[PDB]
Amino acid sequence: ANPALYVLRERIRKGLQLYSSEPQNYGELFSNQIIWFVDDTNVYRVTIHKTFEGNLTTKPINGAIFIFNPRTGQLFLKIIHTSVWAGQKRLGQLAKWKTAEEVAALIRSLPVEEQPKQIIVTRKGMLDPLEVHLLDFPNIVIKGSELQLPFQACLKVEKFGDLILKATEPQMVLFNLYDDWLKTISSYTAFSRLILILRALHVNNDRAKVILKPDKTTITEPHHIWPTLTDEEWIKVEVQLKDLILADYGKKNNVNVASLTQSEIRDIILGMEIFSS
């Protein structure tokens, strides 16, 4: 944004007489388009702590940047250090740029086939440093579509949350967001089930835990986020999670859980529009 630079650029553009004519995602994963949902909304993650006094301090907990390949349910939680998620000036720019540089280093370490053709990014709130530092990972285009995923609840898994919490450095863990929902369903249904688990965990974590793990038989693995179940058990857990998410949405918006249709309930599941020193 230098003004004289724009004068020089516009002199170049008027000399060339060149113009600018130029001024869903949960379901496109099985439509021959790999989408790795690069979301940094959980990047500035901080825990809550209380001292012996009435004042409450801010704990610099380890942030986790979500990269959700929804075709296979692959959740790459790029972890940060405990001292790297707080302290630096311009945390909406510098820490976002450092997380984007770590994501670009991970995309360079992974193959081009391992990288996706698109990135299901969130709304543009901190996307300026991401678009600045996304020149090293241009295979996936970051944009905010109509169908997103609740990446703020992507760290709500027990094993992934423990691996994020017990990490004093950028561990950058990788797991499956839907380990059992992808072994018994399609790619779009697996992305919808993982987004349904994430949306139910964002709405009501107790109802999401009772829906996904109603007993001890749904105990997942150390690299699994969704509960480990069979085909019918995973379908029943996803149906109970969708029912709990519809009940929470109806309680939030003074509506009914059964008021949504089949495609509307599928879109609501998939995430679319229905201490100190």
Binding site for other proteins (CB under 8 A): 1, 3, 5-7, 9-23
Output the smallest distance, CB 193 to other proteins, in A: 35
221: left (phi over 0), alpha (psi -120 to 50) or beta: beta
Minimum CB distance to other proteins smaller for 22 or for 53: 22
Minimum CB distance to other proteins smaller for 18 or for 48: 18
Output the smallest distance, CB 132 to other proteins, in A: 12
Output the smallest distance, CB 94 to other proteins, in A: 22
**Helix or strand (DSSP H, E) at 160:** helix 158-165
Minimum CB distance to other proteins smaller for 19 or for 52: 19
Strand partners, 143: 120
Q: Beta strand pairing status for 64-69 and 37-39?
A: antiparallel
Output the smallest distance, CB 122 to other proteins, in A: 18
Output the smallest distance, CB 21 to other proteins, in A: 4
Instruction: Return d(Cα 77, Cα 65) in angstroms, integer.
Output: 5
**Residue 274 identity (one-letter amino acid):** I
Output the smallest distance, CB 14 to other proteins, in A: 6
DSSP for residue 122: -
Minimum CB distance to other proteins smaller for 9 or for 49: 9
Minimum CB distance to other proteins smaller for 124 or for 251: 124
Instruction: Return d(Cα 27, Cα 29) in angstroms, integer.
Output: 5
Q: Report the length, in residues, of the chain.
A: 277
Minimum CB distance to other proteins smaller for 13 or for 166: 13
Strand partners, 68: 37, 75
Number of Cβ atoms within 10 Å of the Cβ of 262 = 7
